[PDB]
Amino acid sequence: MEMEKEFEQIDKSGSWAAIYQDIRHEASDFPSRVAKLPKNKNRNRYRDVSPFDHSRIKLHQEDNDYINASLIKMEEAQRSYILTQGPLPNTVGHFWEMVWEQKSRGVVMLNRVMEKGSLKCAQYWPQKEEKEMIFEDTNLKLTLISEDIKSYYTVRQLELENLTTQETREILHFHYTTWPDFGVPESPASFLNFLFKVRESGSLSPEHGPVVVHCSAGIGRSGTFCLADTCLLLMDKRKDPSSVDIKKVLLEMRKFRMGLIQTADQLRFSYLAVIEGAKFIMGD
Numbered sequence: 001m002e003m004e005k006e007f008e009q010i011d012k013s014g015s016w017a018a019i020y021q022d023i024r025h026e027a028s029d030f031p032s033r034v035a036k037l038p039k040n041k042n043r044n045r046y047r048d049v050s051p052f053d054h055s056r057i058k059l060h061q062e063d064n065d066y067i068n069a070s071l072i073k074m075e076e077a078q079r080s081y082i083l084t085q086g087p088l089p090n091t092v093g094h095f096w097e098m099v100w101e102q103k104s105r106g107v108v109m110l111n112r113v114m115e116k117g118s119l120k121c122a123q124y125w126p127q128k129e130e131k132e133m134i135f136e137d138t139n140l141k142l143t144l145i146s147e148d149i150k151s152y153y154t155v156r157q158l159e160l161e162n163l164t165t166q167e168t169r170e171i172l173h174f175h176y177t178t179w180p181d182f183g184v185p186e187s188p189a190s191f192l193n194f195l196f197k198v199r200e201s202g203s204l205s206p207e208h209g210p211v212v213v214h215c216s217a218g219i220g221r222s223g224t225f226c227l228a229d230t231c232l233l234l235m236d237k238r239k240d241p242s243s244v245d246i247k248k249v250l251l252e253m254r255k256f257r258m259g260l261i262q263t264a265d266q267l268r269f270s271y272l273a274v275i276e277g278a279k280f281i282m283g284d
């Protein structure tokens with residue numbers, strides 16, 4: 001079926017939970033043996049969210065190459081993304097090592113450091129220009145260059161220096177700051193505006209390594225971001241945009257990381273975002 005009318009048909013019939021459970025039943029199951037080794041217990045935030053062995057990002061280190069991160073490679077859309085958990089106190093150096101080694105331009109952050117009164121990820125970037133951060137375990141230095149605070153999101157320019165080689169690179173930090181503590185946003189308008197700002201920066205384009213995207217577990221909000229982006233790109237590329245099937249795209253992405261889209265409310269919000277976004281791309 002088309003999307004917008006499949007949408008109203010699920011709303012009127014109140015069957016979002018049944019649609020979402022079907023997705024969960026059909027989703028791929030692949031091994032994640034490296035994630036479950038005892039030496040990696042303090043590298044995982046949640047015991048039930050792990051990267052598959054076949055698609056995990058490897059650190060360029062011979063001691064321990066493990067990070068909770070996955071490469072999502074979308075062949076028809078010609079986009080790639082790295083989806084990862086929010087960094088932990090003992091993985092902030094690994095996080096920036098990955099950004100460096102994979103040649104990423106942008107980092108997309110969809111959570112606040114504290115939500116619901118608990119810590120959802122480490123404070124992994126510097127908050128003042130004159131107070132830089134050094135990660136001694138991976139030999140990297142990180143400096144805040146500029147910060148632009150808007151009503152729904154903040155963009156930061158950061159400098160990452162590889163202290164072994166003295167090479168430097170500019171990294172863009174796109175921080176969506178207004179996702180509610182419970183539920184999903186009422187309108188997708190600010191989330192779509194944010195996606196378009198990431199796109200306009202070059203961070204999603206083939207001349208750079210894959211964008212790094214995270215929330216707390218790296219599957220819920222993060223899944224919504226890449227699902228909406230890929231669906232809108234396919235609607236631009238194909239002769240028949242109504243052929244894009246958001247449930248099929250989601251199952252394809254779940255071949256590369258488990259659990260993408262965590263609730264039936266997140267699934268409905270993804271439909272809403274793609275539907276509204278497709279009207280803005282053209283004219284109306």
Ligand SMILES: Cn1ccc(C(=O)NC[C@@H]2CCCO2)n1
Pocket residue numbers: 003004232235236241242274275277278279281282
């Ligand atoms: C981004 N884009 C390019 C073409 C289309 C498109 O025509 N989509 C058809 C409908 C409108 C809402 C749901 O899909 N969208």
